[PDB]
Amino acid sequence: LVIPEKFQHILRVLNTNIDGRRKIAFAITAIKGVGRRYAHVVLRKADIDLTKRAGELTEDEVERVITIMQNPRQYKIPDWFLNRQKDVKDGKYSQVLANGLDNKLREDLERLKKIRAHRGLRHFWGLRVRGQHTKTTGRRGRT
Amino acid sequence: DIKLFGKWSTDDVQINDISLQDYIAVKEKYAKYLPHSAGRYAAKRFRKAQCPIVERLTNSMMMHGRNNGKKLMTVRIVKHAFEIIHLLTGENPLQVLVNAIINSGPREDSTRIGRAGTVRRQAVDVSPLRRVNQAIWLLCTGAREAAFRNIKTIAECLADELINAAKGSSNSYAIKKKDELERVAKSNR
Amino acid sequence: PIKLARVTKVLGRTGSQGQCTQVRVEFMDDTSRSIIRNVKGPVREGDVLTLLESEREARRL
């Protein structure tokens, strides 16, 4: 057992407030763009041990994990681990995080609204887009 | 020799009441090694009077849905519960099962009389087998409700509820529901 | 006072829903006193019942 003197009770990464008294991978998971799975990838890549609580990490480990997550394809993070595989305009492999995820959502809504397609009409009227049977269910949240 | 879970001794325990002496098992012969005998005691009337008491506590611990079919969960849990009990009180853990059965069982109970929707109860008195059964029910249910989320092991929480059911304290969920039954019995008479 | 009791005979089953058994009680004190009594759950003859109120008598439900 241990008694760490320097421990960050509140952490800040990528515009988000991280809780480090939690475990490490499941603290990193809190931000958008990361689940437990990609968290285990990034933290097994940065050499950071999973036994440490997220508040015992030096600034160098937080900065090298950040550096690993901003630049996916350089660190041998597999191409099938990327959130958006081929984006519509540039045609590039990019790992999408919080503000970028939300923005890409907004944009992929706007494109389909300007295009005049069915996916977008669906997304517009507040209906489920996958062709679900809307007779019985798809009620809650409505008046 | 016959030793329960390999370390216990069944033949040294004692029964202080005549009503529960004819029913409660594991004294003379019935004492076994392991709780699971997979026998048929529901075959005929009162044929379940004679099955080992430890098995009886065992059977009732599967009583909620996800745990239902899995019996071994219990012979696991009843294993660590006894080995915990001996550490606290320091007596044969099968004396603690006897005392908890004897004390937790109701004595008098109320039978509902009336028309549906209006409960008016009249006091009658418990049959010995019914005493055993209700008692054990109370033990397993007290253990569950107490152990749902306190993050207690059911081993820890059943040793708790059992020792407390044995001493006569109001800690046990068991002694509580008993005390309510007897008190309603008083209300009516 | 707490008393003890013995089952001499089983007579019938009293109840709305057929719950109670109506049984006959000897006293274990070697007294010859005979009282009918209502009991819940399974009963076979020869069993011993513990009575918290020992002077009470049986009524028909």
Added chain:
Amino acid sequence: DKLNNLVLFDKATYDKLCKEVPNYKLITPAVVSERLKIRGSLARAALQELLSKGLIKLVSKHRAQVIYTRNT
């Protein structure tokens, strides 16, 4: 009421784990974690240290349920 438990030990709490627990008769990680307001993993690994120190008898171990007794 919401529950705060210690993730990593404190000196105060450490005095309790160190000087007290060996007198406790029956010892369970949930018992230790209840009276010392420690979290689960920390209390569990605490008893894992009180193993290596030789201050505590280990009776039986099954999966997540462990049984510990005070030394003599």
Added chain:
RNA sequence: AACGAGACUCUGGCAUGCUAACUAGUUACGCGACCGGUCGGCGUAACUUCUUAGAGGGACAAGUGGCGUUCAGCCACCCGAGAUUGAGCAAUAACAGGUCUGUGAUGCCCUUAGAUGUCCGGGGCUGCACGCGCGCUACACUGACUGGCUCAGCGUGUCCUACGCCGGCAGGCGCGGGUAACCCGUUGAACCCCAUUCGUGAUGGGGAUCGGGGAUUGCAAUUAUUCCCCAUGAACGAGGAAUUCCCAGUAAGUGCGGGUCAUAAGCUUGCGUUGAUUAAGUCCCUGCCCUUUGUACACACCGCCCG
């Protein structure tokens, strides 16, 4: 005396006695291996306990002891594989039940060449502010995850699929066996069992809703058919009045086969596995049955009938 109940057929339990098996194994002996054994590893004689499936035995309340007009039969015990195996078939009668949509089974009506015909190409049965219903899944500590250890049966198959090699995963390629106790297949199914990580908070419990990509099926997938990787991670804190199904290998958990099927099981139909709490009683409720009884009803109370 006759039909209905039972008997009967189908299924499960018994057989170290019988009939036998290279398309199932066993024992025995050889070779093979690694430290006398362990091995689904390879072959020969030995036989049926295993594994099949035929013949026929076996249970008849039988034996003993209790309750019984000692009568039926009811209870307990022993002897025993079994002292309750689960389904099918189902009388005299009826319903003005469901069936023109299963019928080259039809009586009428309508349609009959810009057809109510049929084929072709698209759409639609799938739509969404709402009610009511089966059913799935969960609300976590008897729990989730991560590794490790050993288990089924019924069936399906010209499509099931052995072993390689390329593939993170779905998938490709290929080279093989089986019309099947031969090949998939010692059908290494899920819990469970043993270690590990988690620590009572919307948490790793729960996963809906989505945004991107890969692969299959097919003419054809947009109105996501499904499958797979990352993300998104919302309701949900054991459920109000009411109510449903159930008595022993049973409730329940858990996977598995058959149906539908080009690709498909949150459905059904079967199959094993882990396996209980409680009752062996009563008409309270609900439901129908008899018996007595009243009747001005008999097209039978949806009756009759009075001003």
Added chain:
RNA sequence: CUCCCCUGUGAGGAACUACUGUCUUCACGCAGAAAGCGUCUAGCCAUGGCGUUAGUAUGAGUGUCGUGCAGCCUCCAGGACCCCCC
């Protein structure tokens, strides 16, 4: 009308510190009540459930201080006894 076996808390002692187990005082978490007041439900009606009293009044246990409670000796008593009454 008793006498004398075991139970009590009324008085004297050893012990009391060392021995062990229980009541005091403080930190600790867990169960956790009611008189009532309201609400809902039994056709009408609480004798019930549920809300608020309150997570109050409480009780079972672990570690602190007690110079305690004791256990070992006597009686004073109380009950089993007897008798007696039948």
